[PDB]
Amino acid sequence: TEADMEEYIWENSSSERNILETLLQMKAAEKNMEINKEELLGTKEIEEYKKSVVSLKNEEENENSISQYKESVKRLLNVT
Amino acid sequence: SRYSPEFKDPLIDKEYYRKPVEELTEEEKYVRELKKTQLIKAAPAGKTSSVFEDPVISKFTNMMMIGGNKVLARSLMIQTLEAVKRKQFEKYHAASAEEQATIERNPYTIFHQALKNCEPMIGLVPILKGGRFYQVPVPLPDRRRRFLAMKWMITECRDKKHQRTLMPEKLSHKLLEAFHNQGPVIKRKHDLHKMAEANRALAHYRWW
Amino acid sequence: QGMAFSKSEGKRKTAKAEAIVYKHGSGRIKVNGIDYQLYFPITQDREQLMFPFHFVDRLGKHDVTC
Amino acid sequence: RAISRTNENDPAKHGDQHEGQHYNISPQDLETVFPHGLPPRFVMQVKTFSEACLMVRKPALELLHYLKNTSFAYPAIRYLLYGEKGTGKTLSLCHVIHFCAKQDWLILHIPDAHLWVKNCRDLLQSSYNKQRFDQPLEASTWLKNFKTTNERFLNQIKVQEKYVWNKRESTEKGSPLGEVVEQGITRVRNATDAVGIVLKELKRQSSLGMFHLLVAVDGINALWGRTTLKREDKSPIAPEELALVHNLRKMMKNDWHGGAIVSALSQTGSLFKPRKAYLPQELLGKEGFDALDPFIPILVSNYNPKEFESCIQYYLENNWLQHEKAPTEEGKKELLFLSNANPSLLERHCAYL
Numbered sequence: 231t232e233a234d235m236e237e238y239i240w241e242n243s244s245s246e247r248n249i250l251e252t253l254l255q256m257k258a259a260e261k262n263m264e265i266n267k268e269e270l271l272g273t274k275e276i277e278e279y280k281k282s283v284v285s286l287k288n289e290e291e292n293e294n295s296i297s298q299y300k301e302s303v304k305r306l307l308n309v310t
Numbered sequence: 311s312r313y314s315p316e317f318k319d320p321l322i323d324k325e326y327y328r329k330p331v332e333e334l335t336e337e338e339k340y341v342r343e344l345k346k347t348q349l350i351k352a353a354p355a356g357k358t359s360s361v362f363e364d365p366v367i368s369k370f371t372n373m374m375m376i377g378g379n380k381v382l383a384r385s386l387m388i389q390t391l392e393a394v395k396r397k398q399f400e401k402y403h404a405a406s407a408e409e410q411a412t413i414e415r416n417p418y419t420i421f422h423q424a425l426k427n428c429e430p431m432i433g434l435v436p437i438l439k440g441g442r443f444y445q446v447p448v449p450l451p452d453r454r455r456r457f458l459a460m461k462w463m464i465t466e467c468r469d470k471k472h473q474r475t476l477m478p479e480k481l482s483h484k485l486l487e488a489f490h491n492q493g494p495v496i497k498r499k500h501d502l503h504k505m506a507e508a509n510r511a512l513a514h515y516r517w518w
Numbered sequence: 519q520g521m522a523f524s525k526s527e528g529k530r531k532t533a534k535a536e537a538i539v540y541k542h543g544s545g546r547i548k549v550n551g552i553d554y555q556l557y558f559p560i561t562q563d564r565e566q567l568m569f570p571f572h573f574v575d576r577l578g579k580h581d582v583t584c
Numbered sequence: 585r586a587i588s589r590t591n592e593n594d595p596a597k598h599g600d601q602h603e604g605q606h607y608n609i610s611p612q613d614l615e616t617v618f619p620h621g622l623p624p625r626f627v628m629q630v631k632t633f634s635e636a637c638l639m640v641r642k643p644a645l646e647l648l649h650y651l652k653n654t655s656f657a658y659p660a661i662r663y664l665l666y667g668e669k670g671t672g673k674t675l676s677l678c679h680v681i682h683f684c685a686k687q688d689w690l691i692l693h694i695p696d697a698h699l700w701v702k703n704c705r706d707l708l709q710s711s712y713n714k715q716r717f718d719q720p721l722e723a724s725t726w727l728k729n730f731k732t733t734n735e736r737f738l739n740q741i742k743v744q745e746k747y748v749w750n751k752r753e754s755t756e757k758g759s760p761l762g763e764v765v766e767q768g769i770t771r772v773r774n775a776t777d778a779v780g781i782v783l784k785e786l787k788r789q790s791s792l793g794m795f796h797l798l799v800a801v802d803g804i805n806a807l808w809g810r811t812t813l814k815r816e817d818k819s820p821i822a823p824e825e826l827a828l829v830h831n832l833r834k835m836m837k838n839d840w841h842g843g844a845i846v847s848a849l850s851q852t853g854s855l856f857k858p859r860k861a862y863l864p865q866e867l868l869g870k871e872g873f874d875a876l877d878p879f880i881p882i883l884v885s886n887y888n889p890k891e892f893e894s895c896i897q898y899y900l901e902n903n904w905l906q907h908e909k910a911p912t913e914e915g916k917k918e919l920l921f922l923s924n925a926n927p928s929l930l931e932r933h934c935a936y937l
């Protein structure tokens with residue numbers, strides 16, 4: 231059972247699924263057909279988002295975690 | 311019980327002690343009081359030196375509480391106050407101009423006027439002389455008559471009820487009727503007064 | 519680095535408290551880390567804790583963490 | 585001397601210079617723009633003053649500046665408004681819904697998701713919803729106030745898919761959206777099926793530049809939180825078995841485009857959640873975390889002395905302070921500690937004195 235481990239794996243997770251769906255919708259709306267998940271995986275923004283969500287899943291919620299989460303979301307979605 | 315003698319009462323007023331340098335008598339009094347500084351009793355969980363309350367309201371809230379439910383009595387008092395406030399504002403905004411200008415929206419003055427109107431003036435006592443109980447009118451102090459009026463209002467708001475009636479708006483309507491000099495508590499007061507007047511020929515049986 | 523730092527005790531009706539009064543914050547009360555609003559939902563405790571700060575005319579300039 | 589009743593009803597002009605401005609709203613505007621989410625403890629402050637005055641908050645105005653450059657090609661982005669219980673979370677969304685409603689957007693206003701979960705007596709099953717037990721008594725209320733939400737685009741969206749209703753009526757092509765919503769209301773036997781067909785219709789038209797769908801849900805804690813409703817054999821059901829909420833969960837998954845949805849975490853109904861919890865994760869649970877979507881959380885802080893002075897100066901002009909020993913300068917600090925910079929706590933004390 232992968233739902234009872236020490237750390238929440240970003241791979242094959244619902245967070246990865248919905249962020250990939252969001253990236254697909256964004257690439258389809260921006261008139262871009264060349265989509266590559268391996269290229270988008272190496273982005274620093276999605277890596278920061280993964281680190282933030284893993285830290286929030288592991289350690290309890292405080293303030294710096296949600297602050298970094300909001301910052302990563304605002305820097306990745308490209309919305310002011 | 312758990313408090314020795316020669317102890318004073320916890321003070322509530324603050325502005326009187328914020329600058330106690332008026333004259334000399336009270337200065338010497340407070341100096342001699344603070345010299346030996348006896349063990350003053352602690353403040354209970356019901357008194358506050360704030361200026362947004364009233365001792366009569368606190369006494370009525372304490373009398374309303376049945377058993378041990380301070381939060382329930384406090385919530386009921388807050389509901390009654392907000393209900394009378396809403397009713398005052400609704401009857402103010404739904405009028406003309408002279409009526410809106412000749413009346414106020416302060417519920418404290420209305421409550422004080424209702425208490426002063428529902429306060430009785432004379433009391434009867436069942437003096438047992440020779441084997442019969444005859445009512446004799448006797449004078450009563452201010453605090454006793456105030457407490458009697460408060461308890462009469464409380465028991466009228468409590469006992470006198472049917473099934474569809476509520477409690478906050480019920481007490482609000484009762485207070486609004488008592489302020490207008492036409493209320494059931496005023497009716498009971500008038501009945502007691504006329505009963506005492508009908509038996510006014512028994513004042514010679516008193517001994518004090 | 520604890521300016522305006524002071525502690526005290528207290529025992530009444532089987533209750534032990536250790537208040538930490540400061541003279542450099544706003545006007546809030548912290549009970550066991552969290553604020554007093556989540557721990558004292560009734561206005562009675564709020565008035566009982568406001569009475570000492572009201573008797574000295576010092577409210578928005580003293581912060582405590584008991 | 586507090587500047588409050590000077591700015592007109594224009595959310596698109598609220599800038600950094602209009603700090604603490606009690607703007608007035610027309611009474612007819614509240615009936616159309618806000619026909620769903622209305623707190624019962626605030627309507628009393630509207631019928632007595634006849635002026636929908638709301639203090640401009642710092643975290644509330646900050647969200648309006650983010651929507652000034654929000655592209656329509658990007659998918660829906662949630663904007664959760666969390667904070668301390670009482671600092672203004674349920675009504676903080678009203679300062680944003682009134683802004684997007686004036687820009688000609690599709691407002692999908694939802695009252696409170698707490699009532700859709702708890703306190704549900706009548707229960708009825710369904711067959712055309714993948715076998716799920718939904719609430720038929722709730723669909724008869726949200727569909728009535730939906731027509732008066734946006735009377736400028738419901739008569740333009742045309743039906744582009746045949747929907748087989750029952751064994752006697754159906755839906756034809758080229759029909760306006762305003763008639764499909766008010767079609768199953770007269771038939772309570774299948775009135776709970778309209779909330780699963782109309783809501784999924786705007787997903788296709790929201791991608792165009794003529795329609796801007798915006799889901800205005802108040803309280804996402806009950807959408808993913810567990811329920812307390814039992815069947816006929818005393819057994820609590822799962823929140824993934826109700827057709828009324830099953831189709832609503834799919835909407836908050838950025839499946840369309842055109843603007844961004846909004847949210848507002850409340851506290852009037854958070855099942856299995858403690859009162860000493862104000863964090864979004866501690867009030868939604870594990871089910872309210874795996875599908876949160878990259879959103880922008882906004883922390884609702886307390887009040888500053890700049891806004892606290894605007895509170896007392898607003899009620900003095902309306903002869904609300906009927907107490908004698910109260911306008912004293914020393915007594916102004918007393919009301920600050922009784923509320924501890926909280927608007928809802930101060931409103932309770934000001935409701936009678």
Ligand SMILES: Nc1nc2c(ncn2[C@@H]2O[C@H](COP(=O)(O)OP(=O)(O)O)[C@@H](O)[C@H]2O)c(=O)[nH]1
Pocket residue numbers: 625626638639640668669670671672673674675676677678849850851852926927928929931
């Ligand atoms: N939303 C909102 N509430 C306000 C405002 N000004 C004062 N308030 C009051 O602040 C209180 C906030 O309560 P709220 O936090 O939403 O209650 P909750 O939803 O149960 O957590 C309300 O009862 C309002 O009466 C305002 O501008 N917006």
